[PDB]
Ligand binder design. Structure first.
Ligand SMILES: [Fe+3]
Ligand SMILES: [Fe+3]
Ligand SMILES: [Fe+3]
Ligand SMILES: [Fe+3]
Ligand SMILES: [Fe+3]
Ligand SMILES: [Fe+3]
Ligand SMILES: [Fe+3]
Ligand SMILES: [Fe+3]
Ligand SMILES: [Fe+3]
Ligand SMILES: [Fe+3]
Ligand SMILES: [Fe+3]
Ligand SMILES: [Fe+3]
Ligand SMILES: [Fe+3]
Ligand SMILES: [Fe+3]
Ligand SMILES: [Fe+3]
Ligand SMILES: [Fe+3]
Ligand SMILES: [Fe+3]
Ligand SMILES: [Fe+3]
Ligand SMILES: [Fe+3]
Ligand SMILES: [Fe+3]
Ligand SMILES: [Fe+3]
Ligand SMILES: [Fe+3]
Ligand SMILES: [Fe+3]
Ligand SMILES: [Fe+3]
Ligand SMILES: [Fe+3]
Ligand SMILES: [Fe+3]
Ligand SMILES: [Fe+3]
Ligand SMILES: [Fe+3]
Ligand SMILES: [Fe+3]
Ligand SMILES: [Fe+3]
Ligand SMILES: [Fe+3]
Ligand SMILES: [Fe+3]
Ligand SMILES: [Fe+3]
Ligand SMILES: [Fe+3]
Ligand SMILES: [Fe+3]
Ligand SMILES: [Fe+3]
Lengths: 164, 164, 164, 164, 164, 164, 164
C-alpha cells in the first residue's frame, strides 16, 4: 500500500480496538447482571456505555485502519474475563477496572505512535485521549454513587436514571 | 474628569469588586474540591455561582467605574485564604462565610456612599443590595441540604442538581 | 482518585489558570485606565479581552481539572503588578507584555506535559496553543495602531471600534 | 439565621402586610356595598383594587420575608373597622381614608428601615413607595367622580367602567 | 333588593369567606415558618395554597354575593390563632387542622342552604364541595410525607417540589 | 389634595424641569451653531440630546407632578444664557458646562428630598441619578473628540456620526 | 453661508419657534393645573398638545434653520405669562388664547416671507398654515365642551378622553 504503515503501530491500533470491544462486551454482560440484581437504570447505563463503545470508539478505529489500508485483527483480547458478581458494588468495581484499562490502552498507543513518528496514528488517537477521560468519569461517578455510605437501591436507581 | 468622583468612595467600589472576585475565586476552587469529593452537581453549582459573580457582579462594577471615569484596582483582597477541606460540609461552611462577607461588603459600600452623598454610587449599589440576598439564599439553601441530619451523597446531589 | 494525575503537572495547569486570570485582571484595570484617558473603544476592547479570558480560557481549565479530579488553587500569581500609566501607548505596552507572558505560559505547560507523557494535559493545551496566537495578535494589532506615527485619538478610537 | 435581620424592622414589614390586607379586605367589602347600591362598575373597580393588593403588594411582602427567613404574622390589624354606608359617596370616603393609611404605612417602614441602616428593607420598599402613589391616585380619581356636582349614577358608572 | 336573599344564609356565606381567608392567612404564615425551618419547597407549597384560596375560593364567594346584592362582612374569624412551631411536622399538623375546618365549613353552608331552600346558594356551594376534597387531599398528602418514618429534609423537599 | 406634598420640594422638582428644558433649549441652539460651523453630525448629535431631554426627562417630571397633584411652573430658568461661539470647541465647552449643571441639579433635588423625608420624590429622582451619568458621558465624549490634539473636521464628523 | 438667508426673516422663524415653545410650556403647565382640578383626561390632552408642538412643530423649524445654516435663538418669548386658574373653564380660555397667537404668528412669518420673496421660508411655512388650523380646532373643541351649559366634570372627562 502507498500508505506503508508500520505493522507494529497498526497491531497496537488493532489491539486497542479489541480493548474497546472487551469493554463493550463486559458492559453488555454487566447490563444483564445489573438488571437481574434489580437495577433497571444501572442496566440501561451499561447498555448506553457498550453502545457508545461500538458507535463512537470501534467505528473510528476501523474507519482509520481502512483509511490507511491496514487490517483489523479481532482475537481473544476482546473477550472479558468474567467473575461472579453478587452485589451492584462488585459490578461497578469490574466496570471501573475495565474502563481504567481502556484509558491505559489509549495512552500506550498514543505514546508509542508518537515515539514511532506515526503522526497519523497520534492524531487519530487524540479523540480517544479526550474521550477516555469522559468515559472513565462516567463510570467513576456511578461507582461513587453505589459505594456511598447509607444509600439504598432507589437512591442509586434515581440518580443513575439522570445520566440516561 | 468632569465626574469628579471622590476617591474614597471609588476605592470602596474597587474593593467591593475585589470581594466579589474573591468569592468567584473561592467558588471555582470549591468546585474542584467538591468534584474530587464525589459531588459533581455541587461542583457545577459552584461553577454557576462563580460564573455569575463574573458576568453579573464584576461586570456591573467595572462598567460603572468606566461611566464615572474611575480606576479599578485589583489587589490581594481578591485572593481567598484557602484552608484544607475534608468534607462537603466544610466546603459549604467556607462558601457560606464568603457569601456572607460579600453581603456585608455590599452593605458597607451602600451605607458609606449614601453618607458621602454619592447618590450615583448608592443607586448603582441597589442592584447589589437586592442580589446579595439572592446569592446568600442560594448558598444558604445548599448549606442546609448538606448539613441536614441523615442525608446521603445521592440525596445531596439530587437536590442540588435541581438548582442547575 | 482513579485518574492518578501527576500533582506537579496539575499544579502547572493551576498556575496557568492564575496567569490567564492575571491577564483578565490587568485587562479590566486597563479598561478603566483607557476610559479615563478618553479611549472608550479601547476600554471596550479590554473588557472584551478580559471577558474572553473568563469565559473561554479559565472555564476550560477549571473544567479540565474537574474532569481529572484535580484541585484549582488561586494565589498571588493572579494579581497583576500595576504601574502608573500616563498615555494609551503605555497601556498597550503593558497589555502586550501581559499577553506575551500568557503565551509563554501555555508553551511551558504544553512542553512539560508532553515531556512527562501526560497526553491528557497535552491534548487540553492544544486549544490554548492555537488561541494564544489569536489573543496575542489582537493585542499586538491594537499596539500597532496606538504606536503608529501621526495618528490621533479619533483615529485610534475608530479603528479599534471595528474590532468590537 | 444567616441573614440576621432586625426583628423590630421585620415586624414593621409584617405590620405593613396587615395594612395592605386590611385595604384588600375593605375593598372586597366595599365591592359588595357598591354593587348593592346599584354601582356594578364601582364594585368591579373595588374587586380590582383588592385583587391587586393580593397579587402585587402582599405577594411581594411575603416573598421578601421568606428571602430573609423572617416570619409573617397576621393579626387584627388586617381586619377593617366597618361603618354603615348609605351612599356611594360614603363608600369612596372610606376607600380614600384607607388607601391614604396604606401610603402612610409605606412611608413609615421606608423611613424607619433607612434610619436603622436596613438597606435590604429600604430597597424592597421602593416598589411600594412608587405604587402607593398609583393606588392612591386611582381611588382619589373615583372619589373625585362620585363627589363632583351634578353627576348621576349613570355618569359615575360609565366613567369608572373606563378604568376597568 | 329584588333577590331578597335571607340574611341568615348570606351571613353563612360571608362566614365561609372568612374561613377560606383564615386558611389563606395561616398558609402565608406557614410559608414563612417553613422557609425559616429550611423547607423552601414546602414554603412554596403554602404560598400556592394561600394564593389558590384567594384566586379561586374567595373570588367565587365575593362574586356570588354581588350577583345576589348581598354584603360581605370580614371579621375576626379571618385571623388564625397562631401557636409556636418548632418542626415541619407541627407546621403540617396545623395546616391539616385548618383545611379540615374549611371542609367542615363548606359542608355546613351547603347543608343549611339546602335546608333553607336557598337553591342558589346550594348550587354555588357545589364547586366548593368538590374542591374542598382536592385541597384537603393536597395538604393531607404533604402531611403524610413529613410524618413518614425515616424521611429526611431532602426527601421531603424533593417530593413536595413535584407538587409545584 | 390627598397627596399633601411639600410645596418647597415640589418647587424644586419644577425647577429641575426648567434645568432640563434649559439644556434642551441650549442643545437645539447648539445644533444650529454646529451646523453653521460645518458639523452636520455634531448638529444631529445635539438634536438627539435635546429631543431626549424632552421625551425622557421632562416627560417623566411632568408625569410625576401630575401623579401627586402638583403644579409645574415654567420660568426664566429655562432660557439659556447665550454667548458667541466661533469654534466647535467653544460649542462643546458650553454643552459640557450645561450638562454638568443638569447633573448637579439632579443631585440637589435627590439630596434635599431625602433629607425632607419625601421618599416619593427621592424614588422618582433615581432614574435621573442614573441617566444624568449617561448624558454627561455622551457630551463629555464629544468634548474629548473635539479637544483632542491634531484632529480635523472630518475626523470629528466621522466619530460623532457613530453616536447617532 | 451659501444660502444667504435674510437675518430678519430667519429671526422671525426663530421667534415662531419660541411661540410654539411658549405654547408647549403653557400646555405642560395647564396639564398639571387640569389634573389638580380633577380632570385627568383634559390633563392628558394638554400633554398631547405640548408633545405635538415639540415633535411636529419645533422639530420642523429647527430642521429648516439647519438646512439654510441659520441660528435658532431661544429667549423670553418662550416663557408663558401665567395667571392663576380656579376653574377648568379659565384653563381652556388661556389655551384658546395661546393657540390663537400661534396661528397669528404662523400668518405673520408666512406673510413677511412672501413679501420678502423668501420662497424657501414661505414653502416651509405651508405645513404650519395647514396644521395651525388643526391645533386651534382641537383646543377650540375642548373649549366648547367645557363652556357648554349644564355639563358636569364626568361629561367633560368622557368626551375629552375620546381625543386621546
Ligand atoms: Fe424500571
Ligand atoms: Fe466514549
Ligand atoms: Fe461517552
Ligand atoms: Fe464524579
Ligand atoms: Fe432517591
Ligand atoms: Fe433517602
Ligand atoms: Fe455526575
Ligand atoms: Fe448574583
Ligand atoms: Fe444569582
Ligand atoms: Fe433555604
Ligand atoms: Fe435523593
Ligand atoms: Fe482567547
Ligand atoms: Fe480571543
Ligand atoms: Fe495629521
Ligand atoms: Fe479615523
Ligand atoms: Fe397597587
Ligand atoms: Fe395598582
Ligand atoms: Fe343634569
Ligand atoms: Fe355618562
Ligand atoms: Fe431551594
Ligand atoms: Fe382549592
Ligand atoms: Fe386546589
Ligand atoms: Fe395521599
Ligand atoms: Fe436512611
Ligand atoms: Fe435514607
Ligand atoms: Fe429524595
Ligand atoms: Fe454641513
Ligand atoms: Fe438622557
Ligand atoms: Fe440619553
Ligand atoms: Fe469617554
Ligand atoms: Fe476620520
Ligand atoms: Fe469611518
Ligand atoms: Fe400640531
Ligand atoms: Fe395636532
Ligand atoms: Fe358623560
Ligand atoms: Fe349627563
Amino acid at each position: 500500500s502507498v500508505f506503508n504503515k508500520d505493522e507494529r503501530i497498526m497491531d497496537l491500533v488493532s489491539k486497542h480496538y479489541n480493548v474497546e470491544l472487551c469493554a463493550a462486551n463486559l458492559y453488555f454482560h454487566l447490563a444483564t447482571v445489573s438488571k437481574a440484581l434489580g437495577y433497571d437504570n444501572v442496566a440501561a447505563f451499561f447498555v448506553k456505555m457498550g453502545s457508545d463503545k461500538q458507535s463512537a470508539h470501534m467505528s473510528r478505529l476501523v474507519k482509520y485502519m481502512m483509511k490507511v489500508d491496514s487490517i483489523l485483527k479481532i482475537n481473544q483480547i476482546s473477550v472479558p474475563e468474567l467473575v461472579s458478581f453478587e452485589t451492584i458494588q462488585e459490578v461497578l468495581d469490574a466496570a471501573l477496572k475495565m474502563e481504567s484499562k481502556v484509558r491505559e490502552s489509549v495512552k500506550n498507543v498514543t505514546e508509542i505512535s508518537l515515539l514511532a513518528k506515526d503522526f497519523e496514528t497520534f492524531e487519530r488517537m487524540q479523540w480517544f485521549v479526550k474521550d477516555s477521560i469522559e468515559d472513565l468519569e462516567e463510570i467513576s461517578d456511578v461507582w461513587t454513587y453505589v459505594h456511598s455510605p447509607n444509600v439504598n437501591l432507589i437512591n442509586i436507581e434515581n440518580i443513575v436514571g439522570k445520566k440516561l
